[PDB]
């Protein structure tokens, strides 16, 4: 038996950076843990949500999964940034696209992210309230793109609770409204961060193109996977 400072994650007050990335995938944590992580340990492994706390380049960083869906990556984040008092999340993904002009293997940068979920309706009196990244966090991902020469893609996202859609027209409107990745997660995620005052962003590889049905191969997924979280372990440097 171990104290546990939340319902969720048995780390204790301090075991996190101010700074985490978070992913979906548990083992993807993992991953990124032992390949670019020093003075790493394991802090929490409730639920298999493995969570991790090392160095990037000798400044304090922190990675985590948070499972699939707004309310999964809302009860850990609300977390994190309550009880643990981190300051920056970004969240490291892979996404779908609709976008013509956006093709697999893209390195999406999220500023802002539409949803089907009620979540953001209800904290602001059923009207509607745009799940935004942090400025700061959003430049820092363009910015260390920029400097290791991998082109990017940024605008809006679109968060649904259903990733088996059978909704006619949503892939035409979001086409249509140039929004550029399709995911499950950060929708739920930029509003928690406003509530504490800290900062939050978003930044997702393409995997597949819903439209025109190209997919990526798994060497193609490990390739992205290394350009983008190259991308947002340099901008922690700068958060």
Do not use: W
Request: glycine content about 8%.
């Amino acid at each position: 038996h171990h104290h546990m400072a939340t319902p969720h994650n048995s780390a204790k007050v301090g075991d996190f950076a101010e700074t985490v990335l978070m992913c979906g995938d548990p083992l993807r944590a993992k991953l990124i843990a032992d390949n670019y992580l020093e003075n790493a340990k394991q802090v929490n492994s409730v639920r298999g949500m493995l969570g991790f706390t090392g160095t990037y380049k000798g400044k304090p960083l922190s990675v985590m999964g948070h499972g699939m869906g707004i309310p999964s990556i809302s009860i850990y984040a609300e977390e994190l940034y309550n009880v643990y008092k981190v300051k920056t999340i970004i969240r490291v993904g892979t996404c779908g696209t609709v976008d013509p002009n956006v093709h697999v293997r893209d390195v999406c940068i999220v500023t802002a992210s539409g949803t089907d979920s009620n979540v953001n309706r209800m904290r602001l009196l059923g009207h509607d309230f745009p799940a935004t990244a942090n400025f700061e966090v959003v430049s820092a991902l363009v910015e260390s793109a920029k400097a290791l020469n991998i082109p990017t893609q940024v605008g809006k996202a679109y968060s649904t609770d259903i990733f088996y859609s059978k909704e006619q027209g949503l892939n035409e409107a979001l086409a249509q409204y140039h929004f550029i990745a399709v995911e499950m997660e950060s929708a739920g995620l930029f509003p928690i961060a406003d509530y504490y005052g800290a900062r939050a962003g978003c930044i997702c590889t393409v995997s597949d193109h819903i439209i025109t049905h190209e997919s990526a191969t798994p060497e193609e997924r490990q390739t992205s996977f290394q350009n983008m979280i190259k991308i947002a372990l340099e901008a922690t440097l700068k958060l």
